[PDB]
Design a protein around this ligand. Structure first.
Ligand SMILES: [Mg+2]
Ligand SMILES: [Zn+2]
Ligand SMILES: [Zn+2]
Lengths: 161, 90, 84, 167, 57, 47, 171, 43, 50, 112, 97
DNA sequence: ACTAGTAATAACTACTTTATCTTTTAAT
DNA sequence: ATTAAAAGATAAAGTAGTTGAGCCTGGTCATTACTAGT
RNA sequence: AUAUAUGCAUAAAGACCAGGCU
């Protein structure tokens, strides 16, 4: 067959096939299925590790949930206990996931599925990295930007330094 | 609503380790009383949703002085509003 | 395998400042933990002073394992390293 | 608490199914595999001690401990009293009481003869010199190791075990 | 800026609330007495006490 | 309140009451929202 | 059952014992802390051999504590149960719900389901026993069993045996 | 060595000073004041 | 570039030998520098010679 | 030396191995599945079972100990959970590199 | 509050050669913590119960090859965050070579 | 027939990348 | 013999990181239109 | 057969913003 040309647009991979050409969206499922077929020798020769760093693990299909020690419970005023930015972001991600499931079991207005999936992908990305260039960052409820793990790690006031 | 009163261990929880004997029956310390650090100057208790817990503001840990003035008034909402001014010599 | 024979040691026979400080600290801690003393105690009460007195008389029972960059090591007794 | 020479075996991407132990399939686990490592790391065969051989080695170790402690001076109770510690003493008397009654060859000359006669998985020689065998059918029924060898000759070896060794 | 900005000293307990310094150690510390604040750390072990006494003195 | 960012900050400040001269100086203060040493110099036109 | 193993132990020595007799003290610690113990990977430890002149090596001074760490390598004899291995034992207690047997320090329990139906428990016998036609199992009688399960609690091993096969029973 | 080199930098027609030190350290492909010193023959 | 380096290390399955000083500091160990550039043994021979 | 005694031997880290967490490993290390958006049941303490603050995840207060390790907040290091996603999601830190892989292997047979 | 031992102080201690003082300042005078690791996965997923002395690793079904380490609490938090970001930093106490 | 919870509403320097160019080669 | 095809050199343009240490003080931490209790 | 429970003697807000200190 003829390979396509892959371009990056925000958090999307646009694949154009030169046949006029045809431009389509590279869904994570298809890319993960393609990656799962890579032979161990080809994985080794691609700079990846068969035992430690497999390419298809680069696509997220299950999300780890850190213990409350990573996201300690906060109390805005005395008895009332608030939640950290990570807690709210995980709650929003889980709400998006259950929305995806509950709308998938229902009818399929494909555009709605596409936009809900894009919203879920945006939420996951802002959970991992809220400093994505080219698009507006996710705002917290109070209006301040969401403090992601990337912001916690880097910086002079970050974790390492 | 919160209450300005002298708290006791029999009806209030989460009391501070400071001195509560310098307060009056209204939870406010009289002016002209020499006070040291880590002492309660305003006594406020708040009910829980031992039905009350302590929310009293103490003196600064590394600060001493004499209570100079005590002001009591009402805010916009309609509840109590207290300001305690303490004076010391450097 | 990784050890180096006594007749093939090429490191300096002197005691470095870092080695001296480490031995003094270890000996002081051991003396403070009720260890036998190999020298007489006349009037000194500080374990650091006792360790220094032991070092001056070359009686500290410790061995320095100097590590070569490759991984091999040389074992030097504290009684054979020259102390300035 | 204690550790052996065999270690490492860190996590891999693909899990291994053959992990459980079963003597019928002659699987002994990674700790007691066919090849072990000595002090210098050289490959060595697995050492299996039969009850007579175990009796001889325990008696030798206890007499060596007596030489080390008392200094140049017979009974199971005495050997149990040689060591110290309530748990260790109880364990040693229990194992001596189990071993002396069930030791097939309790004398050194017969032990040397068995050495020679014995002279193949070490579990097989251990089980042949450990538990009594009188018939080929019962020998293969008790443990299936003798059932499938393709060089069996159980008649002559069992005749030796019954006549040359202790019946 | 350099290793001379952090050195091991011997404690002398004195009244009043200011650290006292010899005038000859101001230049390596790059400090004057117009309101400078300086920090002190106390070792909590014999080995680190010996390290401070024999290396950073 | 919604647009916390992309807005000038520090326009209004708490008045200084350490002394009379400090209060007057605070009441007669100007600032430039530039946050390059060219604008920091004392120009001749500042006379 | 009885195996020969190569073991290594890490021993911590306090600075208070830094004397000329420290080798013997380390040997005493090894003798105390090896024999009579049990481990999951190795099983019950019977004893150690040639422990009078074992090589203790050179100590490791732990930074900040001053204690010495010694890695002692030794050759010992141990005892480890095996799945499916038949063994001779002497029984201790006999109950309708099952009976126990002793193999060295190990206690192997045989449940009533694992005795053939010919043998029947009888409390009236003195001592209480499992009897059948020309078959007798009292307390302290030699029996043959087959281990059909092993489980470890770090400190001890627990095993279950069955006598539901041919050429297995009292001898 | 790093401290002994950075310490004088606090105290302190070709480019000289802190800009020149930064230009050297960064290995700039473009030089603010490029120059060549050419020596001639003895005669 | 802490997060970028960490992500690249995770993707490339790099191994850290912990021979430098920074990773010894962040792990709270004795760095192999100065007084930590060696190990101190026990002199069995001299103690026995007593 | 203020930590409680543990029978596990104490040593120091000598090698750090980096890599990616496989979904099987993520499911294995987890102790609870998180699926309920809500936090409280009816606002009388007792957080939702399987929620974002499940007691099996860890303990942060002295009133309740950890239900997985059994120790208090001073010793419990925290325990991870897993959440299943309906659809696969790209990793923001791995957006370009995956594309590079897309320029190396085929999109049908998955071969270089 | 507590005074800050910044990066320049660490550099000065490195120049001085006092490794033990730096170690005690950054561990004993700060957030020291004890963690448990598994000798197979190398990950910090070991469930430990010191009251009844039970150590277990769910993933590798391990109960014996488990070690304990003394690390800064900030290092523990960093490793947990890396695990949360689908990165697996495995701490091994032996060199594979 | 009214009320209050309540939830949703920066330049400097560098690297990398892309398209342009074009020279190159074998084909007209 | 001469020029269409084109693989590849590379010139030009778009994109992206990152900024000296610590210390102190004070201030803030939304908002309002939809729908259920008595 | 006990007898109700009608009870609790310290919990650690953190993140941003602004103004100063050498
Ligand atoms: Mg000054
Ligand atoms: Zn726990
Ligand atoms: Zn594991």
């Amino acid at each position: 067959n003829t390979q396509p040309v892959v371009r990056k647009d925000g958090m999307k991979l646009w694949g154009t096939w030169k046949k006029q050409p045809e431009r389509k969206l590279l869904t994570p499922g298809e890319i993960l299925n393609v990656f799962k077929h890579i032979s161990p020798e080809d994985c080794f020769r691609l700079g990846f590790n068969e035992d430690y760093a497999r390419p298809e693990w680069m696509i997220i299909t299950v999300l780890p949930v850190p213990p409350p020690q990573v996201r300690p419970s906060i109390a805005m005023d005395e008895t009332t206990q608030g939640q950290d930015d990570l807690t709210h972001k995980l709650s929003d991600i889980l709400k998006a996931n259950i929305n995806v499931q509950k709308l998938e079991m229902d009818g399929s207005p494909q555009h709605i599925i596409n936009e809900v999936e894009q919203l879920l992908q945006f939420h996951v990305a802002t959970y991992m990295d809220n400093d994505i260039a080219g698009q507006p960052q996710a705002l917290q409820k109070s209006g301040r930007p969401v403090k992601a793990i990337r912001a916690r790690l880097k910086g002079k006031e970050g974790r390492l330094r | 609503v919160e209450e300005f009163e002298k708290p006791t261990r029999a009806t209030t929880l989460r009391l501070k380790h400071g001195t509560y004997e310098k307060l009056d029956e209204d939870g406010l310390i009289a002016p002209g009383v020499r006070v040291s650090g880590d002492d309660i100057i305003i006594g406020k208790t708040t009910p829980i949703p031992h039905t009350k817990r302590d929310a009293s503001t103490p003196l600064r840990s590394t600060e001493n002085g004499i209570v100079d003035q005590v002001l009591l008034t009402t805010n916009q909402e309609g509840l109590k509003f207290v300001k305690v001014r303490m004076r010391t010599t450097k | 395998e990784l050890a180096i024979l006594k007749e093939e040691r090429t490191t300096t026979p002197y005691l470095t400042k870092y080695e001296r400080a480490r031995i003094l600290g270890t000996r002081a801690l051991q003396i403070s933990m009720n260890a036998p003393v190999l020298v007489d105690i006349e009037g000194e009460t500080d374990p650091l002073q006792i360790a220094m007195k032991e070092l001056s008389q070359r009686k500290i029972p410790l061995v320095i394992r100097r590590y070569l960059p490759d991984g091999s090591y040389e074992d030097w007794g504290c009684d054979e390293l020259i102390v300035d | 608490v204690s550790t052996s020479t065999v270690g490492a075996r860190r996590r891999r991407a693909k899990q291994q199914v053959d992990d459980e132990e079963n003597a019928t399939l002659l699987r002994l686990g990674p700790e007691f595999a066919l090849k072990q490592y000595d002090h210098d790391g050289n490959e060595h065969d697995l050492i299996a001690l039969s009850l007579s051989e175990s009796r001889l080695l325990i008696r030798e170790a206890l007499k060596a401990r007596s030489r080390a402690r008392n200094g140049g001076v017979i009974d199971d109770d005495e050997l149990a009293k040689v060591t110290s510690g309530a748990v260790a003493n109880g364990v040693v008397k229990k194992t001596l009481d189990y071993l002396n009654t069930f030791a097939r060859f309790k004398d050194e000359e017969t032990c040397t003869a068995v050495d020679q006669l014995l002279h193949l998985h070490p579990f097989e020689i251990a089980q042949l010199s450990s538990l009594g065998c009188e018939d080929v059918d019962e020998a293969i029924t008790l443990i299936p190791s003798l059932a499938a060898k393709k060089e069996v000759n159980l008649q002559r070896i069992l005749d030796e075990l019954n006549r040359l060794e202790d019946p | 800026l350099h290793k001379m900005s952090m050195m091991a000293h011997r404690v002398k307990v004195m009244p009043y609330s200011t650290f006292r310094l010899n005038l000859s150690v101001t230049s390596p510390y790059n400090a004057d007495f117009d309101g400078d604040e300086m920090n002190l750390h106390v070792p909590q072990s014999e080995e680190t006490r010996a390290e401070l006494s024999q290396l950073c003195a | 309140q919604k647009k916390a960012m992309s807005s000038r900050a520090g326009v209004s400040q708490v008045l200084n009451r350490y002394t009379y001269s400090s209060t007057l100086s605070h009441l007669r203060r100007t600032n430039t929202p530039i946050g390059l040493a060219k604008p920091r110099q004392l120009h001749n036109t500042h006379w | 059952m009885f195996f020969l193993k190569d073991l290594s132990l890490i021993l911590t020595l306090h600075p208070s014992y830094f004397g000329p007799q420290m080798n013997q003290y380390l040997r005493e610690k090894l003798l105390t802390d090896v024999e009579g113990t049990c481990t999951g990977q190795f099983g019950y430890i019977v004893t150690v051999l040639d422990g009078m002149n074992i090589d203790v090596g050179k100590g490791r001074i732990i930074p900040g504590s001053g204690s010495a760490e010694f890695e002692v390598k030794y050759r010992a004899v141990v005892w480890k149960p095996f799945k499916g291995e038949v063994v001779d034992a002497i029984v201790s207690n006999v109950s309708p719900i099952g009976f126990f047997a002793d193999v060295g320090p190990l206690n192997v329990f045989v449940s009533t389901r694992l005795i053939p139906d010919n043998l029947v428990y009888n409390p009236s016998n003195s001592p209480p026993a499992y009897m059948s036609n020309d078959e007798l199992i009292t307390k302290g009688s030699k029996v043959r069993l087959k281990v059909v399960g092993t489980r470890t609690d770090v400190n001890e091993i627990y095993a279950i045996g069955s006598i539901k096969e041919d050429f297995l029973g009292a001898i | 060595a790093a401290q002994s080199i950075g310490e004088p930098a606090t105290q302190m027609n070709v480019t000289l000073g802190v800009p020149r030190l930064k230009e050297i350290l960064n290995v700039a492909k473009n030089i603010k004041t490029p120059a060549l010193t050419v020596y001639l023959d003895r005669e | 570039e802490t997060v970028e380096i960490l992500f690249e290390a995770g993707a490339a399955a790099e191994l850290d030998d912990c021979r430098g000083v920074s990773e010894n500091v962040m792990l709270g160990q004795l760095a192999p520098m100065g007084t930590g550039a060696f190990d101190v043994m026990i002199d069995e021979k001299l103690l026995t010679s007593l | 030396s203020q930590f409680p005694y543990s029978s596990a031997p104490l040593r120091s880290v000598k090698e750090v191995q980096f890599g990616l967490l496989s979904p099987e490993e993520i499911r294995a290390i987890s102790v609870v599945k998180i699926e309920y958006p809500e936090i409280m049941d009816e606002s009388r303490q007792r957080p939702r079972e399987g929620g974002l603050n499940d007691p099996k995840l860890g303990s942060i207060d002295r009133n309740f100990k950890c239900q997985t390790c059994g120790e208090g907040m001073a010793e419990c290091p925290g325990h991870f959970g897993h959440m299943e996603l309906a659809k696969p999601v790209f990793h923001i830190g791995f957006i370009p590199k995956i594309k590079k892989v897309c320029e190396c292997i085929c999109m049908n047979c998955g071969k270089l | 509050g507590g005074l800050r031992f910044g990066e320049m102080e660490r550099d000065c201690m490195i120049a001085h050669g006092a490794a033990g003082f730096l170690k005690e300042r950054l561990m004993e005078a700060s957030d020291a913590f004890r963690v448990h690791v598994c000798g197979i996965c190398g990950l910090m997923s070991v469930i430990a119960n010191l009251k009844k002395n039970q150590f277990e690793c769910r993933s590798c079904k391990n109960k014996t090859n488990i070690y304990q380490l003394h690390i800064p609490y900030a290092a523990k938090l960093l490793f947990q965050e890396l695990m949360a970001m689908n990165i697996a930093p495995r701490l091994y106490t032996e060199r594979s070579g």
